[PDB]
Amino acid sequence: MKVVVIDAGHGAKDSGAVGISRKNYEKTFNLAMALKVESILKQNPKLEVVLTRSDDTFLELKQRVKVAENLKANVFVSIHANSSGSSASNGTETYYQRSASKAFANVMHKYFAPATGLTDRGIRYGNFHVIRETTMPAVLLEVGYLSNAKEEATLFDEDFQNRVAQGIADGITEYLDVK
Ligand SMILES: [Zn+2]
């Protein structure tokens, strides 16, 4: 089968970005999203879904990449939530670091971006360890900004997460052509 590695950014001592409300942590959002994407993709027998973390545990960047490399993942998707010094910043972004990951970023963004319904900030280059050191198509998704009051609430909305999780799942399913 085709192996899909889903990486929920941060975890444990690393809370990631703290929402403007000061009541939500990015790590919480990342895990909830990863678990939802896993549940959706698990229904596909042509896929073998592996999560770098399935609970609130700490994982070094090198460790997340090692799993993907060791299990020979076909794709790698790191899920994150963004933060800005200005509470006005908002939108969804998809990052790639290597040329071989651009096709996947394009397909992923095609289904992922519309699902968030947030401002489409497009596909951008990002020098992030997990998408740089990986050798298979790898993208990092910054779903939305936790620094924006309305957007933070939206990212922690159950329906939003389910819709976006399906979009992320579609990006993977479509790219791997396992419909
Ligand atoms: Zn992050």
From TrEMBL:
Chain positions recorded as Zn(2+) binding sites: H10, E26, H80
Q: Where is the MurNAc-LAA domain?
A: 65-173
Q: By what name is this protein known?
A: CwlV
* Source organism (scientific name): Paenibacillus polymyxa (Bacillus polymyxa)
